[PDB]
mmCIF file of all heavy atoms in Angstrom:
data_model
loop_
_atom_site.group_PDB
_atom_site.id
_atom_site.type_symbol
_atom_site.label_atom_id
_atom_site.label_comp_id
_atom_site.label_asym_id
_atom_site.label_seq_id
_atom_site.Cartn_x
_atom_site.Cartn_y
_atom_site.Cartn_z
ATOM 1 N N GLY A 97 -74.967 102.880 167.670
ATOM 2 C CA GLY A 97 -75.241 102.504 169.096
ATOM 3 C C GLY A 97 -76.113 101.260 169.241
ATOM 4 O O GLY A 97 -75.970 100.325 168.453
ATOM 5 N N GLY A 98 -76.868 101.219 170.308
ATOM 6 C CA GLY A 98 -77.728 100.091 170.569
ATOM 7 C C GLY A 98 -78.924 100.042 169.615
ATOM 8 O O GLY A 98 -79.033 100.872 168.626
ATOM 9 N N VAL A 99 -79.863 99.153 169.824
ATOM 10 C CA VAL A 99 -80.998 98.953 169.095
ATOM 11 C C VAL A 99 -82.247 99.324 169.913
ATOM 12 O O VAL A 99 -82.380 98.765 170.968
ATOM 13 C CB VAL A 99 -81.161 97.499 168.533
ATOM 14 C CG1 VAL A 99 -82.459 97.296 167.875
ATOM 15 C CG2 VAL A 99 -79.978 97.203 167.567
ATOM 16 N N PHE A 100 -83.057 100.270 169.469
ATOM 17 C CA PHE A 100 -84.298 100.589 170.079
ATOM 18 C C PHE A 100 -85.429 99.712 169.381
ATOM 19 O O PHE A 100 -85.511 99.567 168.185
ATOM 20 C CB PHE A 100 -84.695 101.997 169.871
ATOM 21 C CG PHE A 100 -83.721 102.992 170.537
ATOM 22 C CD1 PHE A 100 -82.597 103.459 169.884
ATOM 23 C CD2 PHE A 100 -84.019 103.508 171.776
ATOM 24 C CE1 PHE A 100 -81.792 104.396 170.497
ATOM 25 C CE2 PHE A 100 -83.165 104.425 172.430
ATOM 26 C CZ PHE A 100 -81.993 104.856 171.741
ATOM 27 N N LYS A 101 -86.313 99.165 170.230
ATOM 28 C CA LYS A 101 -87.534 98.568 169.685
ATOM 29 C C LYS A 101 -88.611 99.708 169.496
ATOM 30 O O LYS A 101 -88.709 100.560 170.375
ATOM 31 C CB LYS A 101 -88.080 97.508 170.604
ATOM 32 C CG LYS A 101 -87.238 96.236 170.665
ATOM 33 C CD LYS A 101 -87.824 95.210 171.613
ATOM 34 N N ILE A 102 -89.333 99.673 168.387
ATOM 35 C CA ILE A 102 -90.353 100.684 168.117
ATOM 36 C C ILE A 102 -91.582 100.039 167.598
ATOM 37 O O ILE A 102 -91.544 98.929 167.000
ATOM 38 C CB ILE A 102 -89.770 101.706 166.993
ATOM 39 C CG1 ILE A 102 -89.486 101.002 165.692
ATOM 40 C CG2 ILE A 102 -88.502 102.459 167.456
ATOM 41 C CD1 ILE A 102 -89.020 101.947 164.520
ATOM 42 N N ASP A 103 -92.690 100.749 167.874
ATOM 43 C CA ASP A 103 -94.062 100.303 167.363
ATOM 44 C C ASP A 103 -94.482 101.427 166.377
ATOM 45 O O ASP A 103 -94.598 102.524 166.717
ATOM 46 C CB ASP A 103 -95.130 100.271 168.464
ATOM 47 C CG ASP A 103 -94.862 99.071 169.372
ATOM 48 O OD1 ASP A 103 -94.755 97.974 168.844
ATOM 49 O OD2 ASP A 103 -94.865 99.308 170.536
ATOM 50 N N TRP A 104 -94.694 100.987 165.102
ATOM 51 C CA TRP A 104 -95.031 101.922 164.070
ATOM 52 C C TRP A 104 -96.467 102.481 164.397
ATOM 53 O O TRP A 104 -97.379 101.651 164.761
ATOM 54 C CB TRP A 104 -94.949 101.299 162.687
ATOM 55 C CG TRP A 104 -93.533 101.221 162.326
ATOM 56 C CD1 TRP A 104 -92.673 100.217 162.568
ATOM 57 C CD2 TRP A 104 -92.788 102.289 161.719
ATOM 58 N NE1 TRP A 104 -91.398 100.547 162.113
ATOM 59 C CE2 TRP A 104 -91.473 101.785 161.562
ATOM 60 C CE3 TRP A 104 -93.114 103.540 161.218
ATOM 61 C CZ2 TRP A 104 -90.472 102.610 160.998
ATOM 62 C CZ3 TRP A 104 -92.112 104.316 160.579
ATOM 63 C CH2 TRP A 104 -90.801 103.802 160.500
ATOM 64 N N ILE A 105 -96.706 103.723 164.172
ATOM 65 C CA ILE A 105 -97.988 104.355 164.274
ATOM 66 C C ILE A 105 -98.531 104.633 162.913
ATOM 67 O O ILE A 105 -99.758 104.503 162.738
ATOM 68 C CB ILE A 105 -97.918 105.592 165.173
ATOM 69 C CG1 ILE A 105 -97.531 105.202 166.612
ATOM 70 C CG2 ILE A 105 -99.290 106.270 165.224
ATOM 71 C CD1 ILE A 105 -97.302 106.432 167.478
ATOM 72 N N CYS A 106 -97.673 104.992 161.949
ATOM 73 C CA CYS A 106 -98.110 105.321 160.609
ATOM 74 C C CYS A 106 -96.966 104.930 159.721
ATOM 75 O O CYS A 106 -95.810 105.416 159.898
ATOM 76 C CB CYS A 106 -98.408 106.828 160.443
ATOM 77 S SG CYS A 106 -98.832 107.287 158.777
ATOM 78 N N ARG A 107 -97.153 104.027 158.726
ATOM 79 C CA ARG A 107 -96.130 103.719 157.752
ATOM 80 C C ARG A 107 -96.361 104.406 156.430
ATOM 81 O O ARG A 107 -95.695 104.064 155.445
ATOM 82 C CB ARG A 107 -96.074 102.183 157.567
ATOM 83 C CG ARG A 107 -95.551 101.377 158.727
ATOM 84 C CD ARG A 107 -95.290 99.913 158.349
ATOM 85 N NE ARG A 107 -94.685 99.082 159.385
ATOM 86 C CZ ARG A 107 -95.432 98.537 160.390
ATOM 87 N NH1 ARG A 107 -96.714 98.771 160.433
ATOM 88 N NH2 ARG A 107 -94.824 97.768 161.296
ATOM 89 N N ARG A 108 -97.268 105.361 156.391
ATOM 90 C CA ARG A 108 -97.550 106.142 155.174
ATOM 91 C C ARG A 108 -96.638 107.363 155.010
ATOM 92 O O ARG A 108 -96.158 107.844 156.070
ATOM 93 C CB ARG A 108 -98.975 106.543 155.037
ATOM 94 C CG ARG A 108 -100.020 105.552 155.405
ATOM 95 C CD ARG A 108 -100.667 104.914 154.247
ATOM 96 N NE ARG A 108 -101.028 105.794 153.156
ATOM 97 C CZ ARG A 108 -102.261 106.271 152.917
ATOM 98 N NH1 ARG A 108 -103.260 105.918 153.731
ATOM 99 N NH2 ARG A 108 -102.488 107.071 151.915
ATOM 100 N N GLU A 109 -96.470 107.827 153.895
ATOM 101 C CA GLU A 109 -95.675 108.998 153.556
ATOM 102 C C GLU A 109 -96.435 110.285 153.651
ATOM 103 O O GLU A 109 -97.649 110.319 153.573
ATOM 104 C CB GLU A 109 -95.018 108.908 152.175
ATOM 105 C CG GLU A 109 -94.194 107.687 151.983
ATOM 106 C CD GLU A 109 -93.335 107.748 150.787
ATOM 107 O OE1 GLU A 109 -93.864 107.910 149.656
ATOM 108 O OE2 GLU A 109 -92.058 107.674 150.913
ATOM 109 N N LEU A 110 -95.721 111.369 153.972
ATOM 110 C CA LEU A 110 -96.217 112.740 153.983
ATOM 111 C C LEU A 110 -95.237 113.654 153.233
ATOM 112 O O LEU A 110 -94.040 113.788 153.651
ATOM 113 C CB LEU A 110 -96.478 113.238 155.364
ATOM 114 C CG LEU A 110 -97.104 114.701 155.362
ATOM 115 C CD1 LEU A 110 -98.552 114.653 155.028
ATOM 116 C CD2 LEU A 110 -96.891 115.310 156.773
ATOM 117 N N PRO A 111 -95.592 114.280 152.109
ATOM 118 C CA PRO A 111 -94.653 115.176 151.412
ATOM 119 C C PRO A 111 -94.454 116.471 152.241
ATOM 120 O O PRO A 111 -95.366 116.968 152.875
ATOM 121 C CB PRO A 111 -95.371 115.514 150.121
ATOM 122 C CG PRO A 111 -96.522 114.519 150.050
ATOM 123 C CD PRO A 111 -96.907 114.186 151.392
ATOM 124 N N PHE A 112 -93.222 116.956 152.110
ATOM 125 C CA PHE A 112 -92.845 118.215 152.758
ATOM 126 C C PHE A 112 -93.696 119.392 152.427
ATOM 127 O O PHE A 112 -93.949 120.306 153.215
ATOM 128 C CB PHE A 112 -91.351 118.547 152.481
ATOM 129 C CG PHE A 112 -90.344 117.636 153.172
ATOM 130 C CD1 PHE A 112 -89.019 117.693 152.743
ATOM 131 C CD2 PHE A 112 -90.618 116.760 154.170
ATOM 132 C CE1 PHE A 112 -88.032 117.000 153.369
ATOM 133 C CE2 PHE A 112 -89.663 115.999 154.782
ATOM 134 C CZ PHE A 112 -88.349 116.108 154.364
ATOM 135 N N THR A 113 -94.281 119.407 151.178
ATOM 136 C CA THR A 113 -95.100 120.482 150.777
ATOM 137 C C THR A 113 -96.326 120.628 151.693
ATOM 138 O O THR A 113 -96.859 121.692 151.847
ATOM 139 C CB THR A 113 -95.564 120.234 149.310
ATOM 140 O OG1 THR A 113 -96.217 118.958 149.208
ATOM 141 C CG2 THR A 113 -94.350 120.314 148.375
ATOM 142 N N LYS A 114 -96.772 119.523 152.355
ATOM 143 C CA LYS A 114 -97.930 119.540 153.200
ATOM 144 C C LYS A 114 -97.669 120.046 154.640
ATOM 145 O O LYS A 114 -98.594 120.292 155.365
ATOM 146 C CB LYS A 114 -98.570 118.151 153.309
ATOM 147 C CG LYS A 114 -99.321 117.771 151.995
ATOM 148 C CD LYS A 114 -100.447 116.727 152.324
ATOM 149 N N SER A 115 -96.326 120.121 155.052
ATOM 150 C CA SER A 115 -95.974 120.598 156.387
ATOM 151 C C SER A 115 -95.360 121.998 156.350
ATOM 152 O O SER A 115 -94.695 122.387 157.290
ATOM 153 C CB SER A 115 -95.050 119.595 157.075
ATOM 154 O OG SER A 115 -93.885 119.287 156.330
ATOM 155 N N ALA A 116 -95.497 122.689 155.180
ATOM 156 C CA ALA A 116 -94.802 124.023 155.098
ATOM 157 C C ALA A 116 -95.314 125.012 156.063
ATOM 158 O O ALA A 116 -94.651 126.046 156.312
ATOM 159 C CB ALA A 116 -95.008 124.510 153.621
ATOM 160 N N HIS A 117 -96.520 124.828 156.657
ATOM 161 C CA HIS A 117 -97.019 125.731 157.670
ATOM 162 C C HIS A 117 -96.597 125.525 159.065
ATOM 163 O O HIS A 117 -96.989 126.193 160.002
ATOM 164 C CB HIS A 117 -98.596 125.726 157.566
ATOM 165 C CG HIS A 117 -99.141 124.402 157.920
ATOM 166 N ND1 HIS A 117 -98.986 123.312 157.162
ATOM 167 C CD2 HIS A 117 -99.888 124.046 159.022
ATOM 168 C CE1 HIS A 117 -99.640 122.292 157.690
ATOM 169 N NE2 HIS A 117 -100.185 122.667 158.812
ATOM 170 N N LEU A 118 -95.791 124.449 159.310
ATOM 171 C CA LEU A 118 -95.407 124.078 160.655
ATOM 172 C C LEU A 118 -93.893 124.422 160.854
ATOM 173 O O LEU A 118 -93.031 124.027 160.087
ATOM 174 C CB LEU A 118 -95.553 122.563 160.874
ATOM 175 C CG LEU A 118 -97.012 122.071 160.764
ATOM 176 C CD1 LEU A 118 -97.120 120.595 160.975
ATOM 177 C CD2 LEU A 118 -97.899 122.777 161.743
ATOM 178 N N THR A 119 -93.637 125.259 161.850
ATOM 179 C CA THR A 119 -92.309 125.629 162.267
ATOM 180 C C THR A 119 -91.937 125.079 163.581
ATOM 181 O O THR A 119 -92.828 124.879 164.424
ATOM 182 C CB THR A 119 -92.159 127.171 162.310
ATOM 183 O OG1 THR A 119 -93.174 127.762 163.181
ATOM 184 C CG2 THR A 119 -92.321 127.728 160.938
ATOM 185 N N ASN A 120 -90.682 124.712 163.762
ATOM 186 C CA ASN A 120 -90.188 124.089 165.019
ATOM 187 C C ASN A 120 -89.441 125.094 165.882
ATOM 188 O O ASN A 120 -88.321 125.460 165.529
ATOM 189 C CB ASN A 120 -89.274 122.911 164.592
ATOM 190 C CG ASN A 120 -88.705 122.187 165.876
ATOM 191 O OD1 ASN A 120 -89.149 122.472 166.949
ATOM 192 N ND2 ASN A 120 -87.848 121.257 165.600
ATOM 193 N N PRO A 121 -90.115 125.526 167.013
ATOM 194 C CA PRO A 121 -89.340 126.517 167.872
ATOM 195 C C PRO A 121 -87.985 125.984 168.298
ATOM 196 O O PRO A 121 -87.101 126.860 168.562
ATOM 197 C CB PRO A 121 -90.300 126.629 169.060
ATOM 198 C CG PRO A 121 -91.674 126.289 168.470
ATOM 199 C CD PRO A 121 -91.420 125.256 167.467
ATOM 200 N N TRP A 122 -87.759 124.718 168.388
ATOM 201 C CA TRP A 122 -86.448 124.237 168.869
ATOM 202 C C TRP A 122 -85.408 124.214 167.783
ATOM 203 O O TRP A 122 -84.243 123.878 168.097
ATOM 204 C CB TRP A 122 -86.610 122.865 169.577
ATOM 205 C CG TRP A 122 -87.469 122.800 170.743
ATOM 206 C CD1 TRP A 122 -88.186 121.632 171.208
ATOM 207 C CD2 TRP A 122 -87.802 123.818 171.717
ATOM 208 N NE1 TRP A 122 -88.834 121.975 172.334
ATOM 209 C CE2 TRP A 122 -88.663 123.265 172.675
ATOM 210 C CE3 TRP A 122 -87.443 125.209 171.804
ATOM 211 C CZ2 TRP A 122 -89.147 124.046 173.728
ATOM 212 C CZ3 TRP A 122 -87.924 125.895 172.846
ATOM 213 C CH2 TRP A 122 -88.798 125.335 173.791
ATOM 214 N N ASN A 123 -85.707 124.525 166.555
ATOM 215 C CA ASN A 123 -84.786 124.742 165.485
ATOM 216 C C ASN A 123 -84.984 126.097 164.776
ATOM 217 O O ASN A 123 -85.252 126.252 163.645
ATOM 218 C CB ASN A 123 -84.828 123.626 164.462
ATOM 219 C CG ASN A 123 -83.607 123.642 163.544
ATOM 220 O OD1 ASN A 123 -82.537 124.109 163.960
ATOM 221 N ND2 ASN A 123 -83.744 123.113 162.331
ATOM 222 N N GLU A 124 -84.942 127.184 165.643
ATOM 223 C CA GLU A 124 -85.032 128.582 165.143
ATOM 224 C C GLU A 124 -86.215 128.847 164.335
ATOM 225 O O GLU A 124 -86.266 129.749 163.498
ATOM 226 C CB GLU A 124 -83.758 128.926 164.375
ATOM 227 C CG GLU A 124 -82.464 128.662 165.159
ATOM 228 C CD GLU A 124 -81.269 129.058 164.215
ATOM 229 O OE1 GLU A 124 -81.312 130.183 163.656
ATOM 230 O OE2 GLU A 124 -80.355 128.289 164.181
ATOM 231 N N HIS A 125 -87.360 128.060 164.549
ATOM 232 C CA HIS A 125 -88.627 128.293 163.843
ATOM 233 C C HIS A 125 -88.444 128.071 162.317
ATOM 234 O O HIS A 125 -89.238 128.606 161.513
ATOM 235 C CB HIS A 125 -89.228 129.655 164.102
ATOM 236 C CG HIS A 125 -89.797 129.751 165.508
ATOM 237 N ND1 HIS A 125 -89.040 130.215 166.548
ATOM 238 C CD2 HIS A 125 -90.997 129.486 166.008
ATOM 239 C CE1 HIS A 125 -89.795 130.201 167.639
ATOM 240 N NE2 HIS A 125 -91.008 129.729 167.319
#
Side-chain angles (χ1 to χ4, degrees), residues 97-100 102-113 115-125:
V99 173
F100 298 88
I102 62 179
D103 289 308
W104 285 88
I105 298 173
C106 177
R107 293 191 176 79
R108 315 261 315 259
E109 300 195 303
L110 181 78
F112 287 169
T113 56
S115 58
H117 62 294
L118 299 181
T119 53
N120 181 5
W122 298 155
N123 194 26
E124 305 180 47
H125 287 90

